Amino acid sequence: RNETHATYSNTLYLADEIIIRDLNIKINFACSYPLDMKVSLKTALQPMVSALNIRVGGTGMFTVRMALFQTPSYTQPYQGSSVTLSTEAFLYVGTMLDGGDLSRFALLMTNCYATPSSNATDPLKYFIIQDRCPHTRDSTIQVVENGESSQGRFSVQMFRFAGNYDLVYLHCEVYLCDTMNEKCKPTCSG
Amino acid sequence: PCQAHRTLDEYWRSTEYGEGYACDTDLRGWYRFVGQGGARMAETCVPVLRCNTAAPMWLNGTHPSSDEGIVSRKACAHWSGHCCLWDASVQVKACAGGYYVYNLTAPPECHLAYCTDPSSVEGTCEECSIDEDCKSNNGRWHCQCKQDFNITDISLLEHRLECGANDMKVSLGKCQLKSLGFDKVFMYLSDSRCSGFNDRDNRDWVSVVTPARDGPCGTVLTRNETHATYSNTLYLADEIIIRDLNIKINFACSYPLDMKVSLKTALQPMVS
Amino acid sequence: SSQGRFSVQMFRFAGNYDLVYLHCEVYLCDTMNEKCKPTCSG
Numbered sequence: 001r002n003e004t005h006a007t008y009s010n011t012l013y014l015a016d017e018i019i020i021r022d023l024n025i026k027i028n029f030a031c032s033y034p035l036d037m038k039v040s041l042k043t044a045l046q047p048m049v050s051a052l053n054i055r056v057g058g059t060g061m062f063t064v065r066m067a068l069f070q071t072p073s074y075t076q077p078y079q080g081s082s083v084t085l086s087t088e089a090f091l092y093v094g095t096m097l098d099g100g101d102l103s104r105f106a107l108l109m110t111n112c113y114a115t116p117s118s119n120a121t122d123p124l125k126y127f128i129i130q131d132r133c134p135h136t137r138d139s140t141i142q143v144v145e146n147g148e149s150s151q152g153r154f155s156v157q158m159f160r161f162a163g164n165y166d167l168v169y170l171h172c173e174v175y176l177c178d179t180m181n182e183k184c185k186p187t188c189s190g
Numbered sequence: 191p192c193q194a195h196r197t198l199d200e201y202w203r204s205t206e207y208g209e210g211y212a213c214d215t216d217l218r219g220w221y222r223f224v225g226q227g228g229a230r231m232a233e234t235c236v237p238v239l240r241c242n243t244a245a246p247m248w249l250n251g252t253h254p255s256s257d258e259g260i261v262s263r264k265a266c267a268h269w270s271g272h273c274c275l276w277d278a279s280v281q282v283k284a285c286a287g288g289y290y291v292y293n294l295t296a297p298p299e300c301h302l303a304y305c306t307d308p309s310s311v312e313g314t315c316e317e318c319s320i321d322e323d324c325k326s327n328n329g330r331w332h333c334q335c336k337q338d339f340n341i342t343d344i345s346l347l348e349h350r351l352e353c354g355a356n357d358m359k360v361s362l363g364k365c366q367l368k369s370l371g372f373d374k375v376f377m378y379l380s381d382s383r384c385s386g387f388n389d390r391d392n393r394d395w396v397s398v399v400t401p402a403r404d405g406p407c408g409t410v411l412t413r414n415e416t417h418a419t420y421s422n423t424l425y426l427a428d429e430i431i432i433r434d435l436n437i438k439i440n441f442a443c444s445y446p447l448d449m450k451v452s453l454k455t456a457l458q459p460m461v462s
Numbered sequence: 463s464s465q466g467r468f469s470v471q472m473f474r475f476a477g478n479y480d481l482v483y484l485h486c487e488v489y490l491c492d493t494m495n496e497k498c499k500p501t502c503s504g
């Protein structure tokens with residue numbers, strides 16, 4: 001045996017008779033064993049230790065945005081505090097989603113409206129999108145996507161609120177929906 | 191003591207200097223060694239013909255730790271081949287910070303002077319976080335946290351879950367787990383590859399960060415009609431194996447589905 | 463001897479581990495050609 005194996009070496013003699021006279025036969029055989037084995041038990045063990053559970057909680061809020069766009073195709077964001085338009089000029093907007101798990105949710109739009117102010121609860125409201133769908137009584141409104149992915153967009157002609165109202169804002173309301181659990185796309189018709 | 195001392199900016203007191211003849215007979219009072227020679231004076235009997243002296247001196251035993259006060263020591267003298275043949279009286283007082291003081295007395299005869307080994311100027315105490323007192327144990331400076339930071343039960347264990355939109359994380363006070371009986375902790379999610387790490391925002395914190403998706407580190411999302419909550423279990427053990435007090439902090443936080451969104455630009459048209 | 467036995471308190475790996483499996487690798491030696499007695503001290 002050397003440092004690794006251990007050989008058992010012996011020689012075998014074969015003949016057809018008691019006495020040998022030609023072609024002596026020697027079966028020189030040796031089989032070795034390595035010195036290092038690998039062993040493991042065949043039983044799984046399941047101990048038990050007491051577990052103290054401190055169940056703690058929290059709440060989170062996702063990040064989601066809304067940018068004015070200088071151009072059609074919804075490519076670049078407005079950065080000025082105020083934008084001047086003609087009434088005939090078309091408005092071009094869209095909403096971003098950076099909250100998290102963008103694979104699972106679909107940015108879906110319950111309702112958006114226009115008020116002369118930043119007060120979201122201003123009673124004077126023009127629902128620019130009404131119940132997940134564009135108004136049909138207004139035809140200048142058109143949508144490209146809502147709830148199709150994490151980003152919805154749409155365009156419409158500018159207006160002004162009748163009266164002493166020279167300003168218009170956009171308060172929109174978004175609802176997350178699972179893209180596999182339920183179908184999110186609202187397909188409305190008159 | 192710590193405020194009434196005279197500094198000695200002399201680089202020739204080091205144990206590496208070749209040879210000399212200066213003996214200190216006029217030295218009286220508290221002294222604070224400053225410079226390249228060292229901040230502490232010798233702990234072992236430095237061999238003959240060093241410290242700019244034929245027979246150099248040393249202090250026997252160990253330097254005092256923080257919060258020890260006046261300590262009586264007998265500074266020996268090495269000469270002729272017998273360490274500690276002559277003796278002088280020295281009183282060491284530890285000080286809050288990285289220096290020491292001594293009443294450096296006149297040795298019984300000339301050809302005797304103290305030494306300054308390089309000591310532990312490399313060992314700094316700024317590495318201790320702000321709430322870690324600059325305490326010492328037998329001459330080495332350690333970051334002992336507040337003794338008022340002493341909680342016995344683990345139900346009082348501190349944890350800050352900030353439910354960030356893009357990612358989830360729970361941060362734990364390192365001092366409080368230290369005093370809870372944990373030297374090194376092993377914090378683990380439902381998957382141990384989400385191993386813990388250290389971060390400092392206002393104090394020493396140990397934290398894990400996990401993406402808020404369904405699956406990647408075993409967090410579970412159960413979106414009911416209103417909320418979309420993500421729950422993962424936290425595992426604490428101060429070593430590889432737990433033998434008692436198995437710890438399971440069940441942390442979670444929900445994300446809504448509805449939310450309000452508006453631009454940040456005003457809008458005004460012009461019309462005939 | 464030709465038998466290697468030993469004891470230890472049961473334990474448990476921290477994390478999501480509900481099982482412990484044991485896996486040993488043995489080394490055979492000559493009782494006469496070398497000293498197989500292992501002695502370790504701190």
Ligand SMILES: *[C@@H]1O[C@H](CO)[C@@H](O[C@@H]2O[C@H](CO)[C@@H](O[C@@H]3O[C@H](CO)[C@@H](O)[C@H](O[C@H]4O[C@H](CO)[C@@H](O)[C@H](O)[C@@H]4O)[C@@H]3O)[C@H](O)[C@H]2NC(C)=O)[C@H](O)[C@H]1NC(C)=O
Nearest residue numbers: 001002003004005006007008009029030031032033034035
């Ligand atoms: C310690 O001693 C052991 C026991 O002898 C020794 O292992 C042996 O090594 C030799 C040298 O490699 C092997 O000799 C054989 O020689 C011929 C070719 O030279 C072939 O028969 C063998 O190769 C075969 O390997 C596989 C075996 O099935 C097959 O792929 C195929 O048959 C190949 O032909 C082999 O080289 C001898 O077989 C081994 N014995 C073992 C491994 O059990 C070891 O090398 C020594 N260690 C030292 C000296 O450091």
Ligand SMILES: *[C@@H]1O[C@H](CO)[C@@H](O[C@@H]2O[C@H](CO)[C@@H](O[C@@H]3O[C@H](CO)[C@@H](O)[C@H](O[C@H]4O[C@H](CO)[C@@H](O)[C@H](O)[C@@H]4O)[C@@H]3O)[C@H](O)[C@H]2NC(C)=O)[C@H](O)[C@H]1NC(C)=O
Nearest residue numbers: 057058059060412413414415416417418419442443444445
């Ligand atoms: C959908 O799943 C969500 C996610 O869990 C679930 O919301 C949960 O509602 C319950 C019931 O209100 C909350 O249970 C908590 O329990 C204790 C007291 O019982 C407290 O922690 C909470 O009350 C706190 O409420 C305010 C929170 O700041 C504070 O006034 C104060 O801290 C109160 O202690 C609360 O009642 C549980 O926390 C929420 N989960 C959250 C918020 O993540 C919801 O009910 C489910 N909807 C269904 C099934 O329709």
Ligand SMILES: *[C@@H]1O[C@H](CO)[C@@H](O[C@@H]2O[C@H](CO)[C@@H](O)[C@H](O)[C@H]2NC(C)=O)[C@H](O)[C@H]1NC(C)=O
Nearest residue numbers: 115116117118119120121122123124125171450
């Ligand atoms: C937003 O507009 C409303 C209506 O002008 C403001 O006044 C509130 O109106 C509601 C009914 O719509 C009353 O019940 C409340 O008492 C009113 N006050 C408050 C403080 O809610 C409201 O104040 C405005 N909010 C903002 C943030 O501008």
Ligand SMILES: *[C@@H]1O[C@H](CO)[C@@H](O[C@@H]2O[C@H](CO)[C@@H](O)[C@H](O)[C@H]2NC(C)=O)[C@H](O)[C@H]1NC(C)=O
Nearest residue numbers: 217218219220260279280281292293294295296
């Ligand atoms: C050394 O510290 C001592 C203790 O505070 C200071 O006073 C000495 O006290 C001892 C013990 O009572 C006396 O035997 C010494 O005579 C005192 N020394 C002196 C110089 O009065 C002492 O001042 C410190 N030594 C120095 C040089 O400051």
Ligand SMILES: *[C@@H]1O[C@H](CO)[C@@H](O)[C@H](O)[C@H]1NC(C)=O
Nearest residue numbers: 249250251252264266274277
């Ligand atoms: C000083 O301490 C050293 C080493 O610890 C020891 O050998 C020596 O006896 C001590 N001297 C006195 C005077 O006690």
